[PDB]
Amino acid sequence: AVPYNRMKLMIVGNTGSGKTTLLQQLMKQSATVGIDVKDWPIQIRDKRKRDLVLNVWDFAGREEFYSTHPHFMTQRALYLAVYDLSKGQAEVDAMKPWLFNIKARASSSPVILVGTHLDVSDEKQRKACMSKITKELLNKRGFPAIRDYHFVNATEESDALAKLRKTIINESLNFKIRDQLVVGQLIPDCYVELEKIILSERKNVPIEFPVIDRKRLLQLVRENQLQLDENELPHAVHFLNESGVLLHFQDPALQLSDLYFVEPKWLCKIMAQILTVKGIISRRDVEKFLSKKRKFPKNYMTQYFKLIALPIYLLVPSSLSDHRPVIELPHCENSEIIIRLYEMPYFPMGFWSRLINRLLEISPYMLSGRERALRPNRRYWRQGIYLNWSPEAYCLVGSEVLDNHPESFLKITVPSCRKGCILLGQVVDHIDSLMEEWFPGLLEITLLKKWALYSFNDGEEHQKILLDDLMKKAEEGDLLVNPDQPRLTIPISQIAPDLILADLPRNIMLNNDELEFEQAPEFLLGDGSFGSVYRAAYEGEEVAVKIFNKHTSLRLLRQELVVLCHLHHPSLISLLAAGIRPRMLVMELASKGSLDRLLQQDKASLTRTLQHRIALHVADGLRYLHSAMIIYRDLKPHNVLLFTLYPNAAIIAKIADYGIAQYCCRMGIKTSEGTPGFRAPEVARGNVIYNQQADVYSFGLLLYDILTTGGRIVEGLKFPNEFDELEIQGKLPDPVKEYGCAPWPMVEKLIKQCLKENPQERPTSAQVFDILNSAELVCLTRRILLPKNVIVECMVATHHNSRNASIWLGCGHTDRGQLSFLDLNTEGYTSEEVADSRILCLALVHLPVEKESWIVSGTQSGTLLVINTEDGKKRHTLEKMTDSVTCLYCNSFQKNFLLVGTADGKLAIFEDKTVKLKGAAPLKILNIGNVSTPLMCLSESTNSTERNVMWGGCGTKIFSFSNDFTIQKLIETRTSQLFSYAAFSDSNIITVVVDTALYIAKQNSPVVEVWDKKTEKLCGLIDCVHFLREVTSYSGRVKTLCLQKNTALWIGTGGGHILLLDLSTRRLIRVIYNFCNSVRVMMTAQLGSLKNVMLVLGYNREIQSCLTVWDINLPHEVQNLEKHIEVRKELAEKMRRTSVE
Ligand SMILES: COc1cc(C(=O)N2CCC(N3CCN(C)CC3)CC2)ccc1Nc1ncc2c(n1)N(C)c1ccccc1C(=O)N2C
Ligand SMILES: Nc1nc2c(ncn2[C@@H]2O[C@H](COP(=O)(O)OP(=O)(O)O)[C@@H](O)[C@H]2O)c(=O)[nH]1
């Protein structure tokens, strides 16, 4: 819409050049600490161009501030350059580090070089050097687009600055980015409106910490609604970030997405305060760095911002000593040390701050923190480090300048011993890891040149050989021959030990005499990103040989070794040998192929148990990898190798193909390597830096593929373009609804929790394994939520085993009995008002004659509704009991009988064959108790098929009956022997289950009583709250009780807990919670030839009654899993211990 005449201006230069005083003359000064931001309203007299306003920055020239400048140096700018002329011609050459860094970070930027001090300096000498470098700049590929040059006088307003100012305004209008003019570019009016509110809020934002969260910005934009949207806001924020009026850091590694900085000048001043408030540091900085340090002003804001001080307690990169401290090496013999100079054209801006930060780990001899070695006598200075463990094991990474060489070096000074070779192997890997991630400009194709120093004889000249030439000589032979005479030779293991893989442990090395290998394309096991895998025999075994191709440097091979020869785990593949002469790695053999071959062509052996261990083992490997500061980035259902398809085994899954695995420290990673279709959203974009949590999204996609049995991969094979776009976006479909899989209610919760767009909301790899370690995650098949505000007190499962799996619910949320039909495989809920009063309990009666199926109902009024299961117009009521009906349990001795439990202790037996009559009479009305004692405790005996005695309970009494319909026992329960637990023993009985003894539950009774049927005495008193005391008047009731056949006892508490008691003697197997608020009804059902389901109905309290379906195999699963985890804990410790030893 309206033109946007805003441009950001940057002024760079070395200290003493006069960058600030130059700006002062144009806009018409002891030092420029930090960065000084200004506004420059300039009017273009020529034509009718809008009055330009320039956000001028005054980048400091003092060498201590150079570490944090590049982060505030971005595109959309017109960089100046100031060089002093009193120095002569060396000052122009001294600007070269400044010029190189500008082009590296700001590729499209019209740099103008501006001189100074014309009053007391010459120009002819400077012009000779200035013209030479710019002629050498157009053919350098590292310099910026220098398209001007000037010489400017002192602070007095002379004619020279008039030309300089005219140049800047002309250059800014001539500036073009993406073939479009930056100054005056068209822009939507909404973005300009957002700029206005930010400026207004900048004036009243707190000065101690100026920032607004996402909530504040959301509230402001909502009440304005200046033609904005919810998805156009990130575009608006990013555009304002480029201009320079709102700094937003959306990098997932930084975790600063929520915060919106509305004060760019404040952000560049914090670094100045830290510096000006060495070898020795004190606690003064963390205590009284500024007057804003207090309890509340330094609690919420301090957790938001971090900026290299690892907790110990402060060591900033800019306070280190300028010059190298005095040091003395144990020896200086030319044949006792190893030197690995890195000749580079220029030190990158902030290179040494990161390298010093990275090399502050202490585990070079026991990787992954297996054994924290002795703290070395570390020495600190601006460009270098001096880790020193022993007089025979030291490293001296540090800068060095040689005579007649304007370039910079990176001298390593490791010793020529076994511990010297180990250190050089790791230091070089970490240096190459930094320059691959953070400084790709140096590794651009060949600016960097790596030299290895060797000396045939001590005392002679210490010569140089380019390392790539040594690599070609190393592959043709293991010895170095002197061209002058072959009499004297030195090995390659003393010049470049890492070249010939001499730093690896002696346990793994290619003994090429017991290795029977055939490269013929018949023993082929697959392919890979950079190699091929072949079958082979190593020391009389079966191995998989990874052989690399011609287009592969040793850096690629070493990138795999750092994760393979240092980390040992049952879920990570391991090496047996590694050579360089044929350039192969010898790996373990996955017996039954990669997981992809199982998903597609073997969709018959994937049970719900095997799928869990595969997801568990991969998340187990990720937890170890992420705990060793290593990211994977290549998690696909191709790299998950299976060793055996047995649900109960020590090792099942395994992770391989560590081809693009690189270290991911607290600074994060920047490269975007990966496989299309399996990448996290942050990995898909190439403009952000992501942390290790980006790998969790990749695991979630793998877990998504496991659940759907590779449905997504097959669908994406037809349209690869949509495969990458949909996975990266995150609008993935619901798995159970579309692809047609068996429901898994709380791994779909895990998938939707670890696939969130915001990386901070994704669970850590250590938390995903904890969730997957839940033993109830395997045996919870289904979970249904009933409609809002329904109170169902009874249920029954239609058990014909072949007709239809359905649940019949008697609702009670209204004062009129509603009998509801629930279709389990469809989740179709329908109700029907059939009774005047609430229905208390239901029961299914099945007559084998004529295949008639009927269900009986019990109402509080007293009626007994009977309706056919299939026919909906077969209602016929029986004669009403004296009082309410509470239990209708039906079982056969022979003859099918329908026991009726009336609320006045009156059990009237009714004949199942008599249900067809529309109104009948009880066969024999037996009396157990009076009206005051309810009879609501019917049960049966499942032991030894003893369908003779049917133990029940009336009030606080125990009763029984047989086919003779006589009471064989009437046992009193009101009296308590201990006389202390009588309060919870003075309530009426609820439910009884019998296997060999009697288990008694009472209202509001946290105790369950075990009574022997032979001695009529309470054998045991199990206190439920005793078992809940470890996990927590109290919500520890016993509202339902179900007894599995011969394995365990399921006790359901009123607080939503489920107790699995080991039926052997006493043991508590497990306690289950965080899924329901009040368990009400529990029973065992069988559904669709898939038996062993324990229907648990509870209210998730607005009352949401949840009907979750478990497996009665759970008491075995909880014990099986913990033994399985315990075994893999021993293997993990054994493998790590033997490696570190
Ligand atoms: C017995 O071990 C495996 C067998 C199979 C497999 O089912 N076949 C079936 C038939 C097929 N060929 C038959 C003969 N010819 C016609 C060519 C085609 C290939 C082999 C597939 C994989 C097997 N095991 C295996 N272990 C370790 C790996 C790895 N893979 N490779 C290929 C890797 C793949 C991905 C990531 C890492 C690796 C890996 O590093 N290693 C060491
Ligand atoms: N470049 C320049 N500097 C001058 C001149 N006359 C005096 N100076 C001094 O140079 C200093 C310039 O400081 P400056 O380099 O801008 O500080 P910095 O931005 O922190 O490096 C001022 O403090 C002046 O006292 C002049 O003619 N040219």
Numbering used by the authors: 1329 to 1356, 1365 to 1613, 1623 to 1652, 1658 to 1662, 1666 to 1798, 1806 to 2253, 2259 to 2397, 2409 to 2477, ...
The authors write:
Leucine-rich repeat kinase 2 (LRRK2) is a highly pursued drug target for Parkinson’s disease (PD), which is the second most common neurodegenerative disease projected to affect 17.5 million people by 20401. LRRK2 is a 286-kDa protein containing seven domains (ARM, ANK, LRR, ROC, COR, KIN, and WD40) with kinase and GTPase activities. Autosomal dominant LRRK2 mutations with higher kinase activity are leading genetic causes of both familial and sporadic late-onset PD cases. Here we report high-resolution cryo-EM structures of LRRK2 in complex with a panel of small molecules, including two type I (LRRK2-IN-1 and GNE-7915) and three type II inhibitors (rebastinib, ponatinib, and GZD-824).
For type I inhibitors, we designed an LRRK2RCKW construct with M1732R mutation (LRRK2RCKWm) based on the following observations and rationales. Therefore, we introduced the M1732R mutation, which disrupts COR-B dimerization and LRRK2 filamentation, to prevent protein aggregation. Second, the binding of type I inhibitors could lead to a kinase-closed active-like conformation with flexible N-terminal ARM-ANK-LRR domains, which did not show interaction with the rest of the protein upon activation. We determined LRRK2RCKWm structures with LRRK2-IN-1 and GNE-7915 at overall resolutions of 3.5 and 3.8 Å, respectively. Despite small differences in the overall structures, LRRK2 KIN domains with type I inhibitors and ATP are almost identical with RMSD < 0.5 Å. LRRK2-IN-1 has an IC50 of 65.1 nM to LRRK2 and 1.27 mM to Roco4. Phe1107 and Phe1161 correspond to Leu1949 and Leu2001 in LRRK2, and side chains of both residues in LRRK2 point towards and interact with LRRK2-IN-1. Furthermore, the 1-methylpiperazine group of LRRK2-IN-1 makes more intensive interactions with the kinase N lobe of LRRK2, forming a more intensive and complementary interaction interface, which could, at least partially, contribute to another two orders of magnitude of IC50 difference between LRRK2 and Roco4 with F1107L and F1161L mutations. The cavity shaped by KIN and COR domains in the active-like LRRK2–LRRK2-IN-1 complex is sealed by KIN–COR interactions. This is accompanied with the opening of COR-A and COR-B subdomains, more intensive interactions between the KIN N lobe and COR-B, and a novel interface between the KIN C lobe and COR domain.
